[PDB]
Design a binder for this molecule. Sequence first.
Ligand SMILES: Nc1ncnc2c1ncn2[C@@H]1O[C@H](COP(=O)(O)OP(=O)(O)OP(O)(O)=S)[C@@H](O)[C@H]1O
Ligand SMILES: [Mg+2]
Ligand SMILES: [Mg+2]
Lengths: 262, 1725
Amino acid sequence: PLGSMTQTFSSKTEWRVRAISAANLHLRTNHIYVSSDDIKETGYTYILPKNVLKKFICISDLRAQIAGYLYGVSPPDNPQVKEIRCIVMVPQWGTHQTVHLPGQLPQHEYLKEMEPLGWIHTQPNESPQLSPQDVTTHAKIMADNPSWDGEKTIIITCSFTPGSCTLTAYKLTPSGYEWGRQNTDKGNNPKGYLPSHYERVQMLLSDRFLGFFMVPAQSSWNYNFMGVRHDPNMKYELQLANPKEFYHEVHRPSHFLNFALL
Amino acid sequence: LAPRQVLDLEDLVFTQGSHFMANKRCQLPDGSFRRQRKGYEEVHVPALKPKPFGSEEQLLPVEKLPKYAQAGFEGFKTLNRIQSKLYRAALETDENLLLCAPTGAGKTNVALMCMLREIGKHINMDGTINVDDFKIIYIAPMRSLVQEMVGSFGKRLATYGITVAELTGDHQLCKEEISATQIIVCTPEKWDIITRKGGERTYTQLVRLIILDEIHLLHDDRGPVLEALVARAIRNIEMTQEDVRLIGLSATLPNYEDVATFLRVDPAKGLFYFDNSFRPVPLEQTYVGITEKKAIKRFQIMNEIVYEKIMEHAGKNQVLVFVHSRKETGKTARAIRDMCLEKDTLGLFLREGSASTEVLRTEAEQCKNLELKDLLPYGFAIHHAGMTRVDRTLVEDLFADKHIQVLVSTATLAWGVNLPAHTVIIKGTQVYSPEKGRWTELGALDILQMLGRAGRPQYDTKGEGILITSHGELQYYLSLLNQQLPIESQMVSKLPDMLNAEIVLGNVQNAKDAVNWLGYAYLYIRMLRSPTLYGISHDDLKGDPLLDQRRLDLVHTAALMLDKNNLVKYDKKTGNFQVTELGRIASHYYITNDTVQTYNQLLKPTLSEIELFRVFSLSSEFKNITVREEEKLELQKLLERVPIPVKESIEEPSAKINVLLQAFISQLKLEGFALMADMVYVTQSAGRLMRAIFEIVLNRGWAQLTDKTLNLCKMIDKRMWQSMCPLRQFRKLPEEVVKKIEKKNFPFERLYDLNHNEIGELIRMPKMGKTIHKYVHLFPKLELSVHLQPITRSTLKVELTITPDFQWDEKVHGSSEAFWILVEDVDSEVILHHEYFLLKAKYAQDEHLITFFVPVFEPLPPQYFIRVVSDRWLSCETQLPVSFRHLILPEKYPPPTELLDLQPLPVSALRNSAFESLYQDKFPFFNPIQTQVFNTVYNSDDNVFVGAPTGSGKTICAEFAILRMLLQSSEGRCVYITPMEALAEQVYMDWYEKFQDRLNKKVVLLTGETSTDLKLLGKGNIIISTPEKWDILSRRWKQRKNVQNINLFVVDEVHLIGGENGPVLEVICSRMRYISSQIERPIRIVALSSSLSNAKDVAHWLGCSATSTFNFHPNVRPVPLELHIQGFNISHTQTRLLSMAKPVYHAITKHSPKKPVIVFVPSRKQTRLTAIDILTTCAADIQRQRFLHCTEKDLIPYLEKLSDSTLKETLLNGVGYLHEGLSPMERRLVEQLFSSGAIQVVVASRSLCWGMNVAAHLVIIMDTQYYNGKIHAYVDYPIYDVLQMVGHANRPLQDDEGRCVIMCQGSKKDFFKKFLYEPLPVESHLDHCMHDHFNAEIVTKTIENKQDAVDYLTWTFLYRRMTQNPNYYNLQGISHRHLSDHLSELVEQTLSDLEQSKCISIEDEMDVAPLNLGMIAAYYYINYTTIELFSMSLNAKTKVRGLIEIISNAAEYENIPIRHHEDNLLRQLAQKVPHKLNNPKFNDPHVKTNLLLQAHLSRMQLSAELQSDTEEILSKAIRLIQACVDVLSSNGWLSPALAAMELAQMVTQAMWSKDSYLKQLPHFTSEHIKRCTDKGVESVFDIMEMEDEERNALLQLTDSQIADVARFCNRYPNIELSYEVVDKDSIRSGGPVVVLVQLEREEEVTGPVIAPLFPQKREEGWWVVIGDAKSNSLISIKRLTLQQKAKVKLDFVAPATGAHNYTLYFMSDAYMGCDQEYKFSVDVK
Ligand SMILES: Nc1ncnc2c1ncn2[C@@H]1O[C@H](COP(=O)(O)OP(=O)(O)OP(O)(O)=S)[C@@H](O)[C@H]1O
Ligand SMILES: [Mg+2]
Ligand SMILES: [Mg+2]
């Protein structure tokens, strides 16, 4: 009964708790595990340098997914392995399930002598299977770009397991590449989706070499606080530089501009 | 020391601060009464009658003052009471003064009479002041008063021409704090933050007078700053012995005698106390004390008292009411107005048609300020710092003209402007202090200043000051204003922060130094006269009379608090203090010791922006800040909207400070009267707080955090976020146009690419186009080039080119613009290198070149990053990615030559008793290095290369090749080359005794003077020279017979080819290889160098077979070398030197307790400071004279021969020092005592490491960088200098090992480890010094075409490194025609530069030919830049004056320092020389040489370093004069050529053409020749004709001095000239005519020319000149050297027919008064 009376309201945005959460992601970069299990293998060993991996985690968000394209080489006369040598961050905005990337792929002179190896994205919860939306994303990219081979491009999922960071890497099958581009259902249990659509690759973290990053030229990679500015047919150039953190100042100008008049 | 205690400092702290009342009782003057009234109490104190004039107390008029001081008192007629009693002690006395007087008595003029005596000491004759010689410090309490007194002092002394200015306050870069200024007016905190900074390149050395105004501030909480300032300056007098005068001005308060002792004031000389009777205007005091305690009832009661007292003066006297906020001033002014209309009490302020109410309403309209417009017509006004300044002077002007009756202002008016009023009311005495976080009574200074304005000087016969306060504080303000509030000490609260400041400054280094330092503090004097008051019982006072144990406990307590917070490292057993970088940050940035501990705890490289704002909020400067209940709601609205999240809750005060900082950046006006006050205090201190956090993490290499903190400094300074457009930083712009630009989401880096038309279309505002286009390019912007130069597979040198890409505007950018160069790694995580760049407006359009080294690992990283962030501008950054995908690394250096375990070779193998006598008694056998080469050097004739560490006995290996030359040909000639002239003389000293005093083979040392070097060549068998002295001679090899015939050529220390003057060393050896190639019988070449990584490149470049290549490495030194490299974290140079002072002593006792030690220091002044620092450290352990292994008196036949004061005191205890400022008299004596074992330690500077004939067992290299006075930046030690200093740690026949400790900065630690344990890689830099050598090879016709220039380059060491390291020379491939295209552009650009300067001729872009201009530059070894400028300035009417400002601008004189410690000493020498200058400003090295040359011509003896500065100026002046002689004569100019020929003999003998010709004779006085027109003597030949029987008298000399008068007269050249014209009749106009001139020297002379005041010994040069004087046209000229028989011919062609009378000149170049002149006629047909 309001016969006594009520109270007043105070607003609390949700990114503030996640901003404090993202400030401590560096503690996870020291406990990064990879999956071994009994998953057979498939071919092509993918080596991921630790420096770009730890940098990719600290600029991440514990709930909103971020993604980065993979570009790499293999040693001179040893074509059986695949060394990831650079992660390209492009304008994007993500949710707790999928990531939204533009239709255009990274095009630059530095990556001219490298081949695409797929893409890597963070995941809030560790799933025993590759997400059905990840098949749809990977297969649709292959349908628009023939440079992405089915047996060469992979999907690395950096799942946020408490206090840790476990990495799982998969690759698509002909059954998966098919159904994936047919998929119009953004669901978690879509139809035609079967475990026959993907198979795990072998991934090995190492400190033998060091990778680099590529970020947009006159832009930034994080568009989560400006999704209206995002459009799937946007074009972008790239520069040779390291990306900024998720909650960097240039990623959320509205929080600073709107606070300038009260 | 033993039994100390830890005290509780805050238990001994006077918490009330300035409100602390030490007097327990208060007695008022007679006539004081007090009434009880409406719930309050009033206390009245009557006005004091002036004291009857004392005996001998008359008012002194200004006329009786010293005449030089009356200009500062222009406008005053008679000094008042206190000034006339002080004029003698201030103007005619240097005593420390302390003047006590009530505010308004006129104490400032007494300080002026102190400043006038100081300025009068430094005036000179010209009528000005040598303002480079002194500086005065005026310390005022409030910054508002500082501004006012700068203007008044600047006007009262404007007639002197003296700069008085407030401090810039925001410039550690380009700190023009002073220099231009001479009287600095500052606050106590401002002068202390300056003197806290180390590095005495500051101008505090010139401080002769310090004025401490309102020194009763000692009782205030800011008091400790005055104690720290005085204790620092006074204790500095005890170490410098330079007196500094301290003048204190105080108010009438007790304990003034203790203040006098604290200022070192003699109580019978400088103490002056004038009680309140001496107030010029009598003051009636009324104190109102409120007993009411309700919050707003007391507010109304105060509002009733303020009304009834204004009514007591309404209409009769003006009233000035003081309140303590810029908001209550308007509320109160309206309060005592609304109350009057409530009673119709306003016809009193303004009359019926008043003469003032008309202009009070006509200017209330033009006021345009709404708050003041309401009150102005009624006769009211307000005044505070928030309003405009035109309003304040408007309020001041109307109040000064008796127009406004009531003025309600704050305390700023009392300090800023001298605006007195008859009645002054202080409404309330309570103010909010954000530092204390509560409400506090007003300060004692503010009260005394506001009530000091009561009573106008002349209009009022008395003043009426009214004080309204709470009743419980009446006893305080009664004592403060009636000379009864004692001045106490408030220091113990700030003792830890003040102790650390002296620790960082190096003034205190142990507890004893702090106890002595504490003795100068005002706390100590108060703790002696009233120890009882300061928590010390009178029982314990006499159990410790001077309080030695009490001060020791206070120091021990403060040191433990400082050690716990990691600012100091306290060794409790020794009492020693160790400085830290963290401790230096707190002192230099004025941070309390508790805050930096919080910083050291929470600062992490992975820190967020969220946590960063939290680390700032936890600063202990906000310890008293709380969160009030009335503030929680308004703070809750912002906490839920701040852009940076806050983790803690609103209940904690750390959250509140975070919200106020973010709101201040967003420029949001808050509400709470304490909230906005707390926000101001938080942010006014956030600038220096965040600036400290920036320097902390920047020096730690944290890249991500450095970018965050530096941006927070700029976000706080610019009051904006990064999210906003960087165009709002331009204040000249409306705020709403940029807001429409920002919300239009497009980047700011775009607008650079678009015209001023599309800018208005994007922003949808074509209203103002070019305005934004103007401000876009006014924004700073820099473009970054780079050229990667790989030194090693591990080390990489980087050349960064900075090109400014913006238009400069002094209105926006100022005098300079600052930037930060940041070199980050792959992950943008570690700052591999950071240095500081500063772009000054003077070079705002030039490219800047920066060089640095960064490490590299072999798994070649993807790229590095170079960021250039602006220091002030937000969002102003340029990052250049430095990729390594195309970089070509050099190859791994080959393994060294294995040192064979050979059998030790004795001198038996020489098989020559005459040769064996040179070594058999120095040592029995050779070292393993000298034995391996012996077969190849002594028994072979092949070219040898021996690369061994410094100290491997390589000089003897060079003697092996020399001893072989004398056996195959006893008359053989060898030329030995060494890079340094200091090495050449000691090698000349060593090889003279061995080869000439024992083998009787003549050895010589080249002079650098071409008048004698060619002569020592022919007669000498061993020629010793440096690269420059040999390059000039071997340039003419194909015409000089004695150059191409030498049997041996030895180049020493050839690893210096990569040094500064390495190219010249590369040219000569490459030339010797080419000459031996272009001739029969090759010249043997032996190369000695330090162990090289690419040694076989040098062996290939010098034709050394692999069998003859001996490339050793530092691991085979004959005496083992134990090298230790200690890193030091302190980034401040002067503070880092302090941090390694004690380790210098600790390394001596650890590595060489009994054997000799050499310590290298960066500066000359450091030589003595370290030598003293070592000794007192030796005495601190009570081991005095431990380094004196000789008996105290066996040195006084050596000791008392020197001129220095401290050198003799330090040598007495066994420690000497060497520096360039010392004598040559002094150095050879200290060196002898060092090798004698008498002294164990010597402290030599870095300048003497090449010219030292002493070796030690232990060498300490204290720091590895020095300060360059020209660029005004620190320069790292060259690696070649470090290798030389380590080489001195070598004693073969004395020690089993050699030790060396290198103390360096932590950043340079890994650099020395890679270039001291491994061989040194050397490169060529000839490609940057190509012009001068190409021109020489063109004159000698070695290079006749462009193909020849490419062929000549293949003979160089530069050609072979282009394939081993292509990227070092900006090559991208080592392919065959990659070299040609790179070599061809090098010869194409070098030849075109010479062709532009008119030195060579290019024909069909293939053939080259030298011009006469180039033949002069190559003949006299002069830069082509110098000769080109010589041709444009030498005119037909040039004389001795125009010549000296042509030789001045030579490129060979741009290289010696400009010392602005001296500019006014040169400015007055510009008035000393006989020849004035045109437009002279004295920051150009070419103007200094002109004044220095005239100072030498006039025999003006000057400094000891500027005397030796001319020695290297005159070392090149002869060749510069002869070059002009060859240029003026080539153009057919007669008079300038002969004037230049006379300039040669003028420089040689230091005279003038006007001066007497008898000034050449030795031992003649100055004015000896006023003794000539008295006795008929003019020429030098007269003395030789004056009779010996009477020339014994007259000259008044010493036989000694007339034995040298002959030696000059004998060798004085007089020559009999014979001249004839061949075929006088057969002369056809247009045919040949020859004049034959024969010279017979009349004499028989020995030795060279006698000129003692000239460094180089010269030979007699002569010219024979033909010309027509009336036409000013030289016809013939010819150089010649006259032995005793020489004949000259002068051929020319005849002009038209007629008579044509010519002149026959015979000029000398080293003697004045011998130039003959023969006239003749030539009948032509
Ligand atoms: N010899 C003088 N004859 C007449 N008036 C003088 C004389 N000397 C000073 N005055 C004026 O008396 C006023 C007060 O002088 P001040 O020197 O400012 O008082 P002070 O309090 O002793 O100095 P402070 O506290 O360091 S600003 C000033 O307006 C002077 O210009
Ligand atoms: Mg004063
Ligand atoms: Mg040598």
